Amino acid sequence: GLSDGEWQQVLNVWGKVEADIAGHGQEVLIRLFTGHPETLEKFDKFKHLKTEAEMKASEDLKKHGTVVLTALGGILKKKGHHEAELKPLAQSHATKHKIPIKYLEFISDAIIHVLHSKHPGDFGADAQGAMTKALELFRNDIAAKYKELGFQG
């Protein structure tokens, strides 16, 4: 798993996220949607947004970004014993929304990009590697649950 020092670096940069969860959420989603427009098709209420300008001005989108990063934060803070926080997310993403693991990879990259962009001083080489492992563990445990839930995934 991750070392205590790796989790410290994950939690340190997540500190920066929580100081402005909305702005971070908004930037992560925008990065995801602009990098991987197919992901936007999964969002009934957002997929009419054609441009970055439109995405930035969307309050719905910023609200959802907060929702996403709030749930992820709760998982990250559990540092590897996150079963309980992970369970309802795997559940909804496997039945209600059907989010392929590949899309979770895209959003992981989007998060790492935004974190490197906004907080390079709190997100150097070791920390980027620790966050990489952290998000990998998230996707890995989501996948394991997807399997039980009958979604591939």
Curated annotation (Swiss-Prot):
Pfam families: Globin. Residues 1-147 form the Globin domain. The keyword Acyltransferase does not apply. The keyword Repeat does not apply. Its EC number is 1.7.-.-, 1.11.1.-. Monomeric heme protein which primary function is to store oxygen and facilitate its diffusion within muscle tissues. Reversibly binds oxygen through a pentacoordinated heme iron and enables its timely and efficient release as needed during periods of heightened demand. Depending on the oxidative conditions of tissues and cells, and in addition to its ability to bind oxygen, it also has a nitrite reductase activity whereby it regulates the production of bioactive nitric oxide. PROSITE patterns: GLOBIN. GO terms for biological process: oxygen transport; removal of superoxide radicals. Belongs to the globin family. This is Myoglobin. InterPro entries: Globin, Globin-like_sf, Myoglobin. It comes from Equus caballus (Horse). It catalyses: Fe(III)-heme b-[protein] + nitric oxide + H2O = Fe(II)-heme b-[protein] + nitrite + 2 H(+); H2O2 + AH2 = A + 2 H2O.
